[PDB]
Amino acid sequence: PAGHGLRSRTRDLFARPFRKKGYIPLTTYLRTYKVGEHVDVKVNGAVHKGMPHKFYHGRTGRVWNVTKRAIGVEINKQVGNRIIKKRIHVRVEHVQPSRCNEEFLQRKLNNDKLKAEAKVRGEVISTKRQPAGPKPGFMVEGTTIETVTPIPYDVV
Amino acid sequence: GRRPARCYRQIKNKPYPKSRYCRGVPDPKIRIYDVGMKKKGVDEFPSCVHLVSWEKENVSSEALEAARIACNKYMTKNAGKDAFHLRVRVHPYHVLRINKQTGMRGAFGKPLGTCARVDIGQVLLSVRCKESNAVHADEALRRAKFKFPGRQKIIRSRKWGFTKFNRADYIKYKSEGRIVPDGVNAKLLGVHGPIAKRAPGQAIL
Amino acid sequence: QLNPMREIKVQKLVLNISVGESGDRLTRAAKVLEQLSGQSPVFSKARYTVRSFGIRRNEKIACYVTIRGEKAMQLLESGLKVKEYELLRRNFSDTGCFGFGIQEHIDLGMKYDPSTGIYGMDFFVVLERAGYRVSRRRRCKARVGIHQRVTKEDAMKWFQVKYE
Amino acid sequence: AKSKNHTAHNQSYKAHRNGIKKPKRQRQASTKGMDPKFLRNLRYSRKHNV
Amino acid sequence: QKTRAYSKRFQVKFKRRRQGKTDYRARLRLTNQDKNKYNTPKYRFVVRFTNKDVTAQIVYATIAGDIVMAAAYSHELPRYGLEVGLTNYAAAYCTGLLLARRVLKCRDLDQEYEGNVEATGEDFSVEPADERRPFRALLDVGLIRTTTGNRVFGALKGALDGGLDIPHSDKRFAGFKKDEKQLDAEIHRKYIYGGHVADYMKSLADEEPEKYQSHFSEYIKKGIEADNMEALYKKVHAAIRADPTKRYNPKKLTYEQRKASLVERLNALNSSA
RNA sequence: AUCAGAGUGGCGCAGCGGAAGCGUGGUGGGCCCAUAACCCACAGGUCCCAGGAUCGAAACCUGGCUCUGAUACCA
RNA sequence: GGAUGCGAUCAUACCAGCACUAAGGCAUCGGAUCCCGUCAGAACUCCGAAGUUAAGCGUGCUUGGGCGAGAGUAGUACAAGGAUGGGUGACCUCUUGGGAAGUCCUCGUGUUGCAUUCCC
RNA sequence: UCAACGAGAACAGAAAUCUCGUGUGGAACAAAAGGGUAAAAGCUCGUUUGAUUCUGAUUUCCAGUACGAAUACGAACCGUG
RNA sequence: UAGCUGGAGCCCAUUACGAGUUCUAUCAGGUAAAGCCAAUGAUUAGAGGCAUUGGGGACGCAACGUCCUCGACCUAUUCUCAAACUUUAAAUAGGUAGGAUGGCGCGGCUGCUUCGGUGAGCCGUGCCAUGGAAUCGGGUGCUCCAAGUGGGCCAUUUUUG
Ligand SMILES: [Mg+2]
Ligand SMILES: [Mg+2]
Ligand SMILES: [Mg+2]
Ligand SMILES: [Mg+2]
Ligand SMILES: [Mg+2]
Ligand SMILES: [Mg+2]
Ligand SMILES: [Mg+2]
Ligand SMILES: [Mg+2]
Ligand SMILES: [Mg+2]
Ligand SMILES: [Mg+2]
Ligand SMILES: [Mg+2]
Ligand SMILES: [Mg+2]
Ligand SMILES: [Mg+2]
Ligand SMILES: [Mg+2]
Ligand SMILES: [Mg+2]
Ligand SMILES: [Mg+2]
Ligand SMILES: [Mg+2]
Ligand SMILES: [Mg+2]
């Protein structure tokens, strides 16, 4: 309304990708959701029911209520000077589970394992990542060194 | 009659071509782009010289017509009708609009004419001749460049005729017989396709 | 190959009379086929309402039936007994088939037993080799390879060497 | 005198000068709107805890 | 023949369609479980008839692919007693009974769900009476036209008579009175215990002795007249309910010989002519 | 400059999708010594140029044109 | 080395043209009484094994088309931030970062699950 | 399985009806444009009335008001298979 | 009326927790660029064969034939292109996660769920969990009452007439 209906400006947002038109692979239906997982809303052109508004294509949020044929997602929309946790129900064809927390949930166990292994021995460790910092010195075994000089200008 | 070209010299608007939306346009000045002997093959006119535009602008259809005929009259009178092939390498697809008591209420204008958008280092015309006869074209392009608004060079191109192959490489490939001569163009041969469709003496790895 | 699965055999005859008309005239063109087959033609309504031929759209103009088996062979040999067993070497279509047309009564069957006029008709047969169910069945349908597709030399060298 | 005016100029400043207020994340997140078939069960069990 | 732009814009369909074997519109609807059940798969009762077998499976959908828990064929009926005529309506009945009995025996609830000990045509559903609900399956015909009398619905009757729960109705069992809108107990009984072949064996034997011999060779040479079909099926069903339990294709020639053969064709073509 | 109107038989005009006429003119006869007038018959058209939909256009609508008519004010 | 049923990934799996296949299985196939289907037992349905690997299925081949991968195209096109940067302007350079795409060239042509079954 | 195209068939031709082949959709889906679809969302047939009842939720507009429209559940009653 | 603002407070706070920021992981994009030697649309010129006859000459005594002819057509090319064209596809900008609001054991509830302790969730209890990238730092954290404003203008860059 007010100049723009539900599916405006989506000449390309809602299209299928090239040579991925037609059928829905069964995996998008047999991936199962539980309340709390982080899922990515990406609308699917061909399934017209339960569709989310074009704003929500390409966001992530936590499932908050799961029903038959429908997932309840709870994502942040920024309006004014505040963040509203909007709650939408999207049909399962429009959501894919996210791999944002893949590394997190792997690393959680990878950490608790080393805190256990440290409790084994001298019970001091530090299970933190550090961003790539200064690289230490080393010798370079002198090889053939290629001299490069700026090229004279051939107009052609 | 027609407005000064200074009004339509700069690109300020996104391209506005003829379509199911820009209709009522008149047909452009230019309707012929290849003049002279366009029937001669690759091996006849090797030397090629281009008039290259050096500033982003809108060369009008009238300008890009008058330029070719000014490049043709010289070439014809001096070096004869059988020694040059001229090709105007740009097409008037941009449609200029004109807006003409009532002011700028409803200010969108009806189409006026048609002009071709050029860019830095865009070949604008080409002549092909025989190196013995190249000087005439060298001067004919210079005599035509005073019909365009910007700066242009008159650059001989390193390639052979209107083909994508340099003089050295094309002569190498002629002696190796690895090139199909098509007319004004030529085609390399190679290692793809079916062995069958090749002529008995035209098979390469 | 001389593999006796590859035996050419008439799939079906098809009988078509299109009158461009309707009403009682076409109802009689139904009988001129009903006697021939023993099975009821299905009408073929027009399309496109092309006026210069005098037809509206969606109105029944034609009448056809498909015959297959012993009856189709029986009536096909009478169809060529009309032509004196000779076709035009072009009536054979490039894919698998050939056809012709006749005026009814130089077949057999008494003439005004309904008092119906002489309707000419379209004979058209598509030969098959055994196993086009592979291109016709609902589950796992696919083309038939070249080695078992009747072609023009196959239809011609079916027509002239045998069946006559 | 053109009474139709529109900008978003200065609106990001007004939004952000007092922060983009995120809501306090909550222990015991709200259930209103959830699946009534799920919530009736959930209530009834808590009715019959021991 | 089909041009380059055609090939380049072509989208291929799913493999199990280019082979013409699966209906995905049916499959989505059969496998798709409600997302508030989270794992509990919908077990499909998948029956398929070839020209000489009646395959049957209970299968569920997994990401990796469908996983079978009980497969029952008609070519394992000879071990039970049926040697001839193994793709008929009653053979599919027996195959359904066998698959239901084996699912029951594998999940160990057969003794509380024995089904009908004896076959009947009058439609059957089980009492879910106490604490153990019957194994619930969803029938999957596949591509067959579900017309009345279909062997698939004989297999449905057998799967129920084994005790399985499969949602159903009698509008396709053999012998449904499509005019009057109720089954006939006796005619479905006839179909299930092989009456419809028995009467045709008698019909050929009376006034068609040469087709009877060309048409039922295996019945002949196993000495089974149309007289002995029902009791035969009694014994085979009893057996079913009591005992439900190098190089010839060419290698892809590799790059070295490929590249050598190529220069050989090339030298042949170039030097010649 | 915009807003409308009409473009249909040689002429001026009818016309509501199945789709071509009104009056007048043209053609061959008849009455007449002859021409009219009158009597009997006969042929008609690129339905303004290019489209689209539409069982189905000449009409509905849209582009390309020519003539005609309107409203064009406070300074 | 195979097959069938149900498949997940959906062209490396398709398309076109060829050659070929042990056992089993698939298929082709024979019939129309039945249930069933139509104009038509061609299709669909019921019944059945007398033959054929001819098609399908499968596998492989092509200096094949397509597809997928890579190298080059190219630090090019563009582009975030900076210049009391150049030029008459269009634009262009330098400084702190990001960085594409066609043609051209080389390679490859499927992976695999559950259940049953065949090989020699 | 559509548009179309290749070959054929009495009168029948560019175009009437029939048959085979190819046919990634070049057709259709009431209307404007865009998106979507090929054992369908298209064409034909079958049975029909969920175009029903109660009151909420949510989205779109948005002041996170109403309305319009739409979606997903719930408690009934049903249609079709 | 919402926003921006003040005043009145209150609530906690160096444990926490948050950020107009970067980092690591992972989603989404169809703009610049590129493309037509890829679909749509536009569009310049040739080359080669080829039509069951688009129309002609001449031979066609003939055709189920051809040389020229304006050229359809197919094949492989070529110039130029698109805000309401796109296979491909940037940069900047967008979303989410980076633990104490986490997990595992035990034994309980359900009127939901399943063939079924099967799941789903909750409930009680016991254990763990070196604080889970960098940097920074008290907070709109919660609320009340209310002001003025709702004519804008310039600049670098993107951009419509
Ligand atoms: Mg708005
Ligand atoms: Mg309103
Ligand atoms: Mg309003
Ligand atoms: Mg997109
Ligand atoms: Mg709807
Ligand atoms: Mg204002
Ligand atoms: Mg179905
Ligand atoms: Mg007269
Ligand atoms: Mg007179
Ligand atoms: Mg500055
Ligand atoms: Mg509302
Ligand atoms: Mg206020
Ligand atoms: Mg856009
Ligand atoms: Mg661009
Ligand atoms: Mg194009
Ligand atoms: Mg590109
Ligand atoms: Mg933006
Ligand atoms: Mg991001």
* C-alpha span between E256 and C134 (Å, rounded): 39
**Total residues belonging to chain E:** 273
Find out whether B152 and B124 touch, Cβ atoms under 8 Å: yes
Q: Please state, in angstroms and as integers, the Cα–Cα distance from residue B154 to each residue in B127, B136, B168, E269, following that order.
A: 11, 12, 22, 48
Q: Find all residues with CB under 8 Å of E159, minimum gap 6, and list them.
A: E45, E56, E96, E97, E99, E100, E137, E139, E166
Q: Please state, in angstroms and as integers, the Cα–Cα distance from residue A5 to each residue in A1, A2, A9, C149, following that order.
A: 5, 8, 9, 57
User: What's the reported resolution, in angstroms, to a tenth?
Assistant: 3.4
Which nt sits closest to A6, CA to C1'? H60
Find out whether E163 and E104 touch, Cβ atoms under 8 Å: yes
C133 and E CB contact within 8 Å? no
Angle at C109 between CA C103 and CA C113, to 5 degrees: 100
* C-alpha span between E189 and E229 (Å, rounded): 12
A96: nearest Cα among A31, A52, A46, A1: A31
Q: Phi/psi at C66 (nearest 5 deg)?
A: -115, 130
Instruction: Kindly give the distance from the C-alpha atom of residue A5 to the centroid of ligand 11, in angstroms, as a whole number.
Output: 15
E43: nearest Cα among E30, E56, E28: E30
Alpha-carbon gap: C49 to the closest alpha carbon of chain E (Å): 34
Query: Residue E132, Cβ neighbours under 10 Å: how many?
Result: 11
Query: Residue E27, Cβ neighbours under 10 Å: how many?
Result: 18
Residues in chain A with CB shorter than 8 Å from the CB of E34 are 67-69
Print burial letters for C55-82: b (CB count within 10 Å at least 16), e (below 16): beeebbbbbbbbbeeeebbebbebbbeb
Is residue B13 marked as binding? yes
- What is the DSSP secondary structure assignment for residue A94, as one 8-state letter? G
E118: nearest Cα among E57, E161, E61, E165: E161
A96: nearest Cα among A48, A57, A131: A57
* C-alpha span between B15 and B99 (Å, rounded): 17
C38: nearest Cα among C12, C2, C75: C75
Q: In chain E, which among 26-45 make CB contacts under 8 A with chain A?
A: 27-28, 31-32, 34-36, 38-39
E236: nearest Cα among E178, E181, E193: E193
Burial of B37 (0-12, 13-18, 19+ CB in 10 A): middle
Find out whether E218 and E85 touch, Cβ atoms under 8 Å: yes
Residues in chain D with CB shorter than 8 Å from the CB of A66 are 35
Residues in chain E with CB shorter than 8 Å from the CB of C138 are 143, 145
Determine which of E11, E28, E35 to mutate to test the interface with A (most A C-beta atoms within 10 Å): E35
* C-alpha span between B60 and B9 (Å, rounded): 9
Tell me the β-bridge partners of A79. Answer: A82
Query: Residue B33, Cβ neighbours under 10 Å: how many?
Result: 16
Asked whether residue A123's C-beta has any atom of DNA/RNA strand I within 7 A, the reply is yes
Find out whether B133 and B79 touch, Cβ atoms under 8 Å: yes
> Token pair 């222990």 is at which residue?
D27
Alpha-carbon gap: A27 to the closest alpha carbon of chain E (Å): 6
Asked whether residue B16's C-beta has any atom of DNA/RNA strand I within 7 A, the reply is yes
Crossing angle of helices E89-107 and E151-161, in 10° steps, is: 40
Q: Which two tokens stand for residue E115?
A: 């089904």
For the CA atoms of A46, A52, A53, A55, what is the dihedral angle to 10 degrees? -110
* C-alpha span between E265 and B200 (Å, rounded): 12
Q: With breaks defined as C to next N over 2.5 Å, after which residues does chain C break?
A: none
What sign does the dihedral D36-D37-D38-D44 (CA atoms) show? positive
* C-alpha span between C104 and A85 (Å, rounded): 82
Q: Phi/psi at B22 (nearest 5 deg)?
A: -100, 85
Asked whether residue B54's C-beta has any atom of DNA/RNA strand G within 7 A, the reply is yes
* C-alpha span between E196 and E230 (Å, rounded): 11
Give the pairing type, strands B57-60 and C120-128.
unpaired
Find out whether C33 and C17 touch, Cβ atoms under 8 Å: yes
Alpha-carbon gap: A95 to the closest alpha carbon of chain D (Å): 19
* C-alpha span between A72 and A61 (Å, rounded): 10
Query: Residue B74, Cβ neighbours under 10 Å: how many?
Result: 19
Contact E19 C140 (CB under 8 A): yes
Q: Please state, in angstroms and as integers, the Cα–Cα distance from residue A42 to each residue in A12, A49, A90, D16, E164, following that order.
A: 13, 14, 10, 29, 41
Q: Phi/psi at E39 (nearest 5 deg)?
A: -155, -20
Which nt sits closest to E49, CA to C1'? G5
Query: Residue C19, Cβ neighbours under 10 Å: how many?
Result: 16
Strand order in the sheet with B47-53: B34-36, B85-88, B122-129, B47-53, B152-156
Q: Which two tokens stand for residue D23?
A: 């809501």
Find out whether B74 and B143 touch, Cβ atoms under 8 Å: yes
Ligand at shortest distance from the CA of A1? 2
- Helix then strand then coil, in percent of chain C rounded to 5, is 30, 25, 45
- Distance I158 C1' – C3 CA (angstroms): 76
E105 and A CB contact within 8 Å? no
